[PDB]
Design a protein around this ligand. Structure first.
Ligand SMILES: [Cl-]
Ligand SMILES: [Cl-]
Ligand SMILES: [Cl-]
Length: 277
C-alpha cells in the first residue's frame, strides 16, 4: 500500500549521499492527447428499502465536443443533466449551470417511498483525478409535524412529507470544480531550505523544476555542485533531492513544494536534516 510522509527528521553522516524522498503520482506529466478535461457530478442512492444495490439517480457533465453530423465544431464546457430512470425525468433536478458556481444541490419535486435512503453527491475530475463526496440522509414521513432538517454533526438529515418536495444541499465552490480558473501553468516543484530554528517563510530557494524539463538552481557553486535531482523527474513523479556529499553546514529544514495550481494541488514535504560526525 502507498503512504505519504509529509514531514520527517532524518540524520545522515557527513560525506554521505543523502536522499530526501519527494514523490507524488499527481505530479506526473502526460501528453495532451490523454487529457480528459471533464468534470462530472452524480447523485447516488443506497436505498434502505432495497438494502442492497446503490443506484445512480442523475449525473451532469461539464464539457463536451459539439458536432453536427461528421463535422466536429469544437469542444466547450456547457452542461446538461441526465436521469437514469425515464420515470425520474422532471422529478429530479440539478441547478442550471451547476458547474458555474459549484451548486450541485439535488431537487426532488415530489418524494416517494422509494426515495428513502442515504444519498451521496459525488464529484469527479477526470483531468485532475479528484474525487469528492458528501452524504445526505432522507426520511419520508406521513406526519407533517415531523418534516424538517438538521445537521447531525457530519451530514444533513432530511425528513420530508410524502409527496412534498425536497432539497439535498451539495455546494463546492473551490475553483477546481467551478468554471472559473486562472490560465493553467505547467506543474512546478520548488526545493528550499533554511537553518535550524527559522520559520518556513524565510527559507532560501534551492531548486526549481518545471514539467517541461526546465530547471533553475540557486546558491553558490559549492552548494549547486552537491545538490541535484535525477533527470525526467516529471515522467515518474519523483523529485527526490540528492545531496552528495552532505556537509555539516547542510543541517537545517528542507522543503519540497509540489504545485499544480489549476488542480488545487499545493503540498509540501518537510525534512529536518541532521548531519552527524
Ligand atoms: Cl460522430
Ligand atoms: Cl410513496
Ligand atoms: Cl524533469
Amino acid at each position: 500500500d502507498r503512504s505519504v510522509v509529509s514531514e520527517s527528521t532524518v540524520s545522515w553522516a557527513a560525506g554521505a549521499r543523502a536522499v530526501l524522498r519527494c514523490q507524488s503520482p499527481r505530479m506526473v506529466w502526460t501528453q495532451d492527447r490523454l487529457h480528459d478535461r471533464q468534470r462530472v457530478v452524480h447523485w447516488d442512492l443506497s436505498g434502505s428499502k432495497a438494502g442492497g444495490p446503490a443506484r445512480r439517480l442523475v449525473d451532469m457533465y461539464s464539457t463536451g465536443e459539439q458536432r453536427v453530423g461528421e463535422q466536429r465544431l469544437g469542444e466547450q464546457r456547457v452542461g446538461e443533466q441526465r436521469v437514469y430512470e425515464p420515470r425520474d425525468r422532471g422529478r429530479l433536478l440539478l441547478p442550471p449551470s451547476a458547474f458555474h458556481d459549484g451548486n450541485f444541490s439535488l431537487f426532488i419535486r415530489a418524494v416517494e417511498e422509494t426515495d428513502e435512503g442515504l444519498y451521496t453527491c459525488n464529484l469527479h475530475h477526470h483531468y485532475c483525478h479528484l474525487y469528492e463526496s458528501l452524504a445526505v440522509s432522507l426520511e419520508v414521513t406521513d406526519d407533517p409535524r415531523a418534516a424538517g432538517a438538521h445537521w447531525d454533526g457530519e451530514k444533513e438529515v432530511l425528513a420530508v412529507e410524502r409527496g412534498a418536495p425536497a432539497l439535498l444541499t451539495c455546494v463546492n465552490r473551490a475553483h477546481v470544480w467551478t468554471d472559473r480558473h486562472l490560465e493553467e501553468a505547467q506543474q512546478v516543484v520548488h526545493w528550499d531550505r533554511q537553518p535550524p530554528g527559522v520559520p518556513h517563510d524565510r527559507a532560501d530557494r534551492l531548486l526549481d523544476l518545471y514539467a517541461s524539463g526546465e530547471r533553475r538552481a540557486y546558491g553558490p557553486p559549492f552548494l549547486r555542485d552537491r545538490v541535484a535531482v535525477e533527470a525526467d523527474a516529471f515522467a515518474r513523479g519523483d523529485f527526490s533531492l540528492l545531496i552528495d556529499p552532505v556537509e555539516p553546514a547542510d543541517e537545517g529544514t528542507y522543503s519540497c513544494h509540489l504545485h499544480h495550481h489549476y488542480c488545487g494541488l499545493h503540498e509540501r514535504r518537510v525534512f529536518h536534516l541532521r548531519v552527524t560526525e
